[PDB]
């Protein structure tokens, strides 16, 4: 199977540097260019540039050459995007992408994409969330995930065994400059006292893992 796996995303201060990696597998690496596309939160798509994976020759859009460098390690089937002098406006999910198996005669399109890696450029410090219970023939219950930076947070219920009726809201940015969200689920009121309900919160950026029993 053709796949592109990215890594290297994280929080970095303005003026700082990050190196992203795009690990390719399941095809002849040097037969396809590697493209880089970014998407700012709640925004559209912007092509950063590409690199010929045999010649190593990069082509950058706009002004990216001033600050960004594409490179390769063919012995690892990996492409890199080194970013320097990062600005707030560089906050975005970064994707790598490749053309289709057959791209001849102008069949050029982004056929396979990486999963994306989020780059956040901020002067604000990392902070893990506090996790509070939202206590309950249908009862609703949840967890409030309060005061964290940066994105993202993931929430599961009962280690993924409870999926039906789960709603995890998009985070809101508070005046403080911190994010907060809730995750909720609906259950039968009969099951309160029967089934244990645990919300599992993961905030990778701060290495915060919290399990929370939501009791009636």
């Amino acid at each position: 199977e053709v796949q592109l796996v990215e890594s290297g995303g994280g929080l970095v201060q303005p003026g700082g540097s990050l190196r992203l990696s795009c690990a390719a597998s399941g095809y002849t690496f040097t037969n396809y260019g590697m493209n880089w596309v970014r998407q700012a939160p709640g925004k559209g798509l912007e092509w950063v540039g590409w690199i010929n994976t045999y010649t190593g020759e990069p082509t950058y859009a706009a002004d990216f050459k001033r600050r960004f460098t594409f490179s390769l390690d063919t012995s690892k089937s990996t492409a890199y995007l080194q970013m320097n002098s990062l600005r707030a406006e560089d906050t975005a999910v970064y994707y790598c992408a490749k053309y289709p198996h057959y791209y001849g005669s102008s069949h050029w399109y982004f056929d396979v994409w990486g999963q994306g890696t989020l780059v956040t450029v901020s002067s604000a410090s990392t902070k893990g969330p506090s996790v509070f219970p939202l206590a309950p023939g249908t009862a609703a219950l949840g967890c409030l995930v309060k005061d964290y930076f940066p994105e993202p947070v993931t929430v599961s219920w009962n280690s993924g065994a409870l999926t039906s009726g789960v709603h995890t809201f998009p985070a809101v940015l508070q005046s403080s400059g911190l994010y907060s969200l809730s995750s909720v689920v609906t259950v039968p009121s009969s099951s309160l006292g029967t089934q244990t309900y645990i919300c599992n919160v993961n905030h990778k950026p701060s290495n915060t893992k919290v399990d929370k029993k939501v009791e009636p």
Binding site: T59, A61, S106, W108, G116, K146, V172, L181, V184
Partner: protein, 212 residues
Amino acid sequence: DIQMTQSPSSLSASVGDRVTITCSASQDISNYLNWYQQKPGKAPKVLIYFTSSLHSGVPSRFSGSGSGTDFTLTISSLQPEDFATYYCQQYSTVPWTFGQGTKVEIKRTVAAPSVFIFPPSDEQLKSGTASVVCLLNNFYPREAKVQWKVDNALQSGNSQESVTEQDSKDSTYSLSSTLTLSKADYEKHKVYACEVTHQGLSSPVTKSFNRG
């Protein structure tokens, strides 16, 4: 650089409807135009390439047309799973550029929200803050009005709302409204109520509690 403009920027249509999305280029792009579909928290997925070619795996209800500076994506029979943002992209001249995106919402029958209110947890209160949360669950259409009443006085302007993306199966939305007070401010009031107005409700629904 070639500017790509889509029209409309957002649309709503019923299951089975024909939907068209237009893409205009700032100069002739020689049929070098692709369409992508992007669902929440996923990478874009190619649907149509080189103006009119349907990608393997993509349902035949998707088609593309156009030439010169004017292009169209047609969805011949819209399905609930087609909730997504659609993007056109030119590859005539570097840098490659995308349109701004068109958000497609799926119409469905009116569905009133189920409303729930949550008092602040003891856990949060012990830290000196109080968040009161109102949940509106599984409604359509998206517009809903939430008022906060604290001892009959309105505090709606002090709250923050978040709305889920449209569900890709049942086409509904959910909404949270959160009103956060200092522990001190919380303790100077008795009745906390959220009052909900929506097209699915003949009269406002209020959920409330008395502090302690």
